[PDB]
Design a protein around this ligand. Structure first.
Ligand SMILES: O=CCCCC[C@@H]1SC[C@@H]2NC(=O)N[C@@H]21
Lengths: 657, 489
């Protein structure tokens, strides 16, 4: 079989075949000649230029290419043009298997409209509210009391969240209807309002579904997709805390009942919104192969890929709802190349200087091997880290530990945000909401700080590392074994903390306050000039990272955050006070081209916003295109140098004001 | 007790003794001479004698290995040299010539001492002669912590490496007063000879540091690389890194387009051991990189082009930089590893008006004269005389390697097509340039001739380099008998 995706899922598929003993083929674009899925595959064929359209999206190339492998079936994947009719039609022109759902169900359910029809076909507890215009305030109050809901005032013709106000009491109902009619009459030319059961605070619970072309339909355990930034989810978890069998059993039964309704074959997944009063709302249903199943597979072992490919041959499944159980729970997170602390700045075109994944009792699905890069015109996802567990505390701690052991170098990421979110006591309380993120991050993003004991431990580990790397340079036995260091982070030596060290063995020290002070005998295990640093005092265990140094300042990472600790002796400490600290030039002015050349491409527009790290234009000289970018600034005021202006000579190409 | 140094620190500056204490080991400095006077007897100098006479000379010890050093003192007479100051320095250099030990000096002198007359010139001449004679015998490093003017500037110049401190140091031959007197332009001391000027414009300073503390901390690290003398072998340090570490990221560094640029450090860093690069002259002639690095625990010399800056084109400044680095590396038996990516020489009238012919020959002379083991890797391209200059196999090179997408040709395809068909029918571009580039802009022809040993996968570079550098440990080559060469100055 041949896949249709070029991400982690492709690798997953070419991995499921291992046990299924199925030879696999994987196509690629020109830029992806070095992707892992190309080498993992048994066969590879090029699909032209790497721009999205020609790459994979070029059905004609793809369907035509499906004539040499011999494979009797070809996976549709989950992204790009997966589950598409124009594609399903073409594949049934050449009479080949789709390894996916049937057309009628797909167009009946994935369609934007008429989904409410199928929803109300059997009702299935669809959105509740007075189905019609509320012409009077009396009707609005009466229908609000009917269910005593937060009103969910929404315009009949309005969409996207415009014309919506949340009413909690009758006076609020009247005032918000007065505002809503005024807003909607001006904005959408419709005064027709509707009132529905608004949700106190949503959790966005999701229910998984599987089926088959013969029978033995099964309901998979539900999942969580509460956390969501810009309508994109981050953290997922299958057995949500607010789970009662009274609801859940009916959820599975109703999902299976809806399944046969449209004769769905390859079930996508069911979407719900759940309030603390344990309701459910079948709508916004999915018909795509969601790849958040690893979590469910961790709590079940139900290999969705194997079962769906088995059903693609008109055979029933190998599992029934009778044996499906729960053996704990799993947590999954997504690693993006999106720089959060810097206003969510995108960082692309950077191959991995060097990276190593966490592999301690955890699972990681990724398509980015060492020496791989991310283009602008693709998904900036790095890895899909998922860890098995049985208890919240157990599963989370694992994630905590596994986050710190993920070495990524060569480009930014959002691991700090994931770490801070997981460590927050609100997240460990047990329950969350969908507005959780912006509720806990009002102004931008700011990572939480360190407690006193954590900073002390970081100091101790830094001193141990300094001594261990110092002993390497000495010759033969003429080496020291004890010092007294003065650690102080910050440019002003904030909190000078005297530290000792003794190095009793290769990976054991006798850290103390100073000489003639009680000693603790911690342990540090670190390979010289490497990232990972495992330190264990008593039971507590920590993992820190070592970035680099200039022999007075150490670049060490603590809880997914970079710091610069200063490790200096008595003389250096007493002398660093008497050192000039000059301030570098802070110039917000025009930028000039360093060398002569020709401008062939421009990226930014005249007199608009500019952010740090953004490419601006590209000169070509002596057969070579450079690319001077914007180091750092907010905006510009200038006149653009036109295309093909072979002038340069250190002119003012862009002027920053 | 912190007497007499409060006046110094109040100006945000350190003292000579404090610098010496910071450089060496905690308790291994033994000051040599401390009670010496100037015995001048002129211009009312018979009084105000000083015990130290403005110099601190000792022995010290760094990383368990011996050293010699001296430091000027700015408080006493402004650091001026004399018939008596220079005697201590001469004695130290002579002793460090008998024993195979290097010398490091921290310059702070304000100029010559006028009250001694021509005795200051005598001392300067003796120091110059010692530097000239002992260059190439023991490594010499110089750091400039404060003002350095007059004719005293020449002795740091002859030394192998000169470093500078950022805020409070400068160096030049003639002061701005004379410049105003003759030309009439008002230029400040920093605008004339500041650390930035010598870092970027003149190319004299080999580096710049932000503070004295950082200067000492990194000077120790630099010292950890050098061999002790001319006859001593290259130092080898223990290291947990191993030649079997996987480097497969090199397969993707070179883009598939011939007009796109990349950073050569992405090729340099994987091959060498982790966090073991010490760049030399980082802000001058950025199209070429030179420095020191370790390969399997032994120090080597690195010289590579960079297509990031000016398409990696050789030039005057790059030629001088590479020539000096190669000469120093060969003088002390240090292996050389080079990475080649050059389209040719920089074209321009200013270049010929500035003597490209002289300067470009220096790098070729340095590469041909060298007798240390050499390893060369051609990543993408090498054209014209630039291929010859950058350690080609014919210049007694030990082992040469190429990557599968390399190109070695006489010149670009356009010029060859033009010269090979004078008045051939128009549109000849499309069906001739492509064919010529396909047939002869590839390493197959150069491999057929025997100019590259083998064509290797980019993932095997570390393995090959470690193997070759281990095997070549005991090469013995000698040049014909000469009093000395005649390099194109
Ligand atoms: O084709 C016309 C210009 C080609 C220049 C190619 C580079 S620029 C500097 C160097 N000198 C040459 O002759 N070729 C290279």
């Amino acid at each position: 079989v041949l896949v249709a995706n070029r991400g982690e899922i492709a690798c997953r598929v070419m991995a499921t075949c291992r046990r299924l003993g199925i030879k696999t083929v994987a196509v690629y674009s020109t830029a992806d000649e070095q992707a892992k899925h190309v080498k993992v595959a048994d066969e590879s064929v090029c699909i032209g230029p790497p721009a999205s359209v020609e790459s994979y999206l070029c059905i004609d190339k793809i369907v035509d290419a499906c004539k040499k492998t011999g494979a009797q079936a070809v996976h549709p994947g989950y992204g790009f043009l997966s589950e598409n009719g124009e594609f399903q039609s073409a594949l049934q022109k050449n009479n080949i298997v789709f390894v996916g759902p049937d057309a009628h169900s797909i167009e009946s359910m994935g369609d934007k409209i008429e989904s409410k029809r199928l929803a109300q076909r059997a009702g299935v507890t669809c959105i509740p509210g007075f189905i019609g215009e509320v012409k009077t305030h009396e009707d609005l109050l009466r229908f609000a009391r009917e269910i005593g809901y937060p009103v969910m005032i929404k315009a009949s013709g309005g969409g996207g969240g415009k014309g919506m106000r949340v009413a909690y009491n009758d006076t609020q109902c009247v005032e918000y209807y007065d505002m809503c009619r005024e807003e909607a009459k001006a904005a959408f030319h419709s005064d027709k309002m509707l009132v529905e059961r608004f949700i106190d605070h949503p959790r966005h619970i999701e229910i998984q579904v599987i089926a088959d072309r013969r029978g033995n339909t099964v309901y998979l355990p539900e999942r969580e997709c509460s956390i969501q930034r810009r309508n994109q989810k981050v953290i997922e978890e299958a057995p949500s805390v607010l789970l009662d069998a009274t609801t859940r059993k009916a959820m599975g039964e109703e999902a299976v009942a809806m399944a046969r309704a449209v004769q769905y074959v390859s079930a996508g997944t069911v979407e719900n919104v759940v309030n603390p009063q344990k309701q459910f709302y079948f709508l916004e249903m999915n018909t795509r192969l969601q790849v958040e199943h690893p979590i469910t597979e961790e709590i079940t072992g139900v290999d969705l890929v194997e079962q769906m490919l088995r059903a693609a041959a008109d055979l029933p499944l190998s599992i029934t709802q009778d044996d499906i159980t729960i053996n704990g729970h799993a947590t999954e997170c997504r690693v993006y190349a999106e720089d959060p602390m810097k206003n969510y700045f995108p960082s692309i075109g950077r191959l991995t200087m060097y990276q190593e994944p966490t592999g301690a009792g955890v699972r990681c699905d990724s398509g980015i091997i060492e020496g791989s890069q991310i283009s602008v015109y693709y998904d900036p996802l790095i890895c899909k880290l998922s860890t098995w567990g049985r208890d919240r505390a157990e599963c989370i701690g694992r994630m905590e530990k596994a986050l710190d052991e993920y070495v990524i170098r060569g480009l930014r990421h959002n691991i700090c945000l994931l770490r801070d979110v997981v460590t927050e006591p609100r997240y460990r309380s047990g329950s969350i909401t969908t507005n959780y993120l912006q509720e806990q991050y009002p102004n931008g993003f700011k990572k939480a700080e360190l407690t006193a004991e954590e900073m002390q431990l970081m100091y101790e580990v830094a001193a141990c590392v300094h001594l261990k790397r110092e002993r390497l340079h000495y010759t033969q036995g003429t080496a020291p074994s004890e010092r007294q260091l003065y650690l102080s982070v910050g440019a002003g030596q904030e909190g000078e903390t005297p530290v000792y060290v003794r190095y009793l063995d290769d990976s054991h020290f006798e850290i103390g306050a100073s000489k003639h002070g009680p000693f603790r005998k911690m342990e540090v295990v670190w390979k010289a000039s490497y990232p990972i640093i495992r330190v264990k005092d008593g039971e507590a265990e920590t993992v820190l990272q070592f970035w680099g140094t200039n022999e007075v300042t150490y670049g060490m990472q603590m809880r997914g955050t970079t710091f610069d600790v200063n490790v200096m002796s008595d003389l250096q400490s007493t002398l660093a006070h008497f050192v000039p600290i000059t301030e570098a030039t802070t110039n917000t002015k025009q930028i000039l081209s360093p060398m002569p050349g020709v401008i062939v491409a421009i990226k930014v527009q005249p007199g608009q916003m500019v952010v740090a790290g953004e490419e601006l234009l590209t000169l070509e000289a002596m057969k070579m295109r450079n690319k001077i970018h914007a180091q750092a600034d907010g905006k510009v005021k200038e006149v653009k140098v036109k295309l093909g202006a072979t002038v340069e000579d250190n002119e003012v190409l862009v002027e920053l004001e | 007790p912190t007497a007499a140094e409060d006046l110094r620190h109040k100006k945000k500056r350190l003292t000579a003794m404090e610098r010496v204490q910071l450089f060496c080991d905690p308790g291994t400095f033994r000051e040599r001479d401390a009670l010496v006077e100037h015995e001048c007897h002129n211009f009312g100098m018979e009084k105000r004698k000083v015990p130290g006479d403005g110099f601190i000379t000792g022995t010290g010890k760094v990383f368990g290995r011996p050293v010699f050093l001296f430091s000027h003192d700015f408080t006493v007479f402004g650091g001026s040299l004399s018939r008596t100051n220079a005697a201590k320095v001469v004695r130290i250099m002579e002793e460090a010539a008998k024993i195979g030990v290097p010398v490091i000096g921290f310059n702070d002198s304000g100029g010559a001492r006028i009250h001694e007359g021509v005795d200051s010139l005598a001392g300067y001449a003796d120091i110059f002669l010692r530097n000239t004679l002992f260059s190439g015998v023991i490594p010499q490093i110089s750091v400039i912590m404060g003002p350095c003017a007059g004719g005293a500037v020449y002795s740091p110049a002859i030394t192998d490496f000169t470093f500078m401190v950022e805020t409070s140091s400068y160096m030049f031959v003639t002061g701005p007063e004379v410049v105003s007197a003759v030309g009439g332009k008002l230029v400040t001391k920093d605008e004339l000879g500041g650390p930035h000027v010598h870092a970027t414009k003149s190319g004299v300073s080999a580096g710049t540091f932000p503070n004295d503390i950082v200067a000492m901390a990194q000077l120790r690290r630099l010292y950890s690389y050098l061999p002790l003398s001319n006859r001593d072998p290259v130092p080898v340090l223990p290291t947990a890194d191993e030649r079997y570490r996987d480097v497969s990221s090199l397969n993707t560094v070179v883009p598939t387009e011939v007009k796109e640029a990349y950073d050569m450090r992405d090729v340099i860093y994987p091959v060498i051991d982790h966090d073991s690069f010490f760049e030399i002259q980082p802000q001058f002639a950025k199209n070429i990189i030179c420095g020191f690095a370790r390969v399997e625990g032994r120090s080597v010399c690195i010289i590579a082009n960079q297509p990031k800056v000016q398409a990696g084109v050789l030039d005057i400044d790059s030629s001088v930089k590479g020539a000096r680095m190669v000469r120093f590396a060969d003088a002390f038996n240090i292996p050389i590893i080079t990475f080649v990516d050059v389209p040719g020489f920089l074209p321009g009238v200013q270049q010929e008006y500035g003597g490209i012919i002289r300067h470009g020959a220096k790098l070729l002379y340095a590469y041909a004269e060298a007798t240390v083991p050499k390893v060369t890797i051609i990543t993408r391209k090498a054209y014209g005389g630039a291929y010859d200059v950058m350690s080609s196999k014919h210049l007694r090179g030990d082992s040469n390697y190429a990557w599968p997408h390399a190109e070695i040709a006489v010149m670009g395809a356009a010029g060859a097509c033009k010269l090979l068909y004078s008045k051939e029918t128009a549109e000849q571009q499309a069906q001739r340039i492509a064919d010529y580039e396909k047939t002869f802009c590839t390493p197959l022809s150069a491999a057929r001739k025997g100019f590259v040993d083998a064509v290797i996968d980019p993932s095997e570079t570390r393995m090959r380099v470690c193997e070759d550098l281990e095997r070549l440990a005991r090469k013995q080559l000698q040049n014909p008998w000469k009093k000395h060469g005649n390099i194109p100055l």
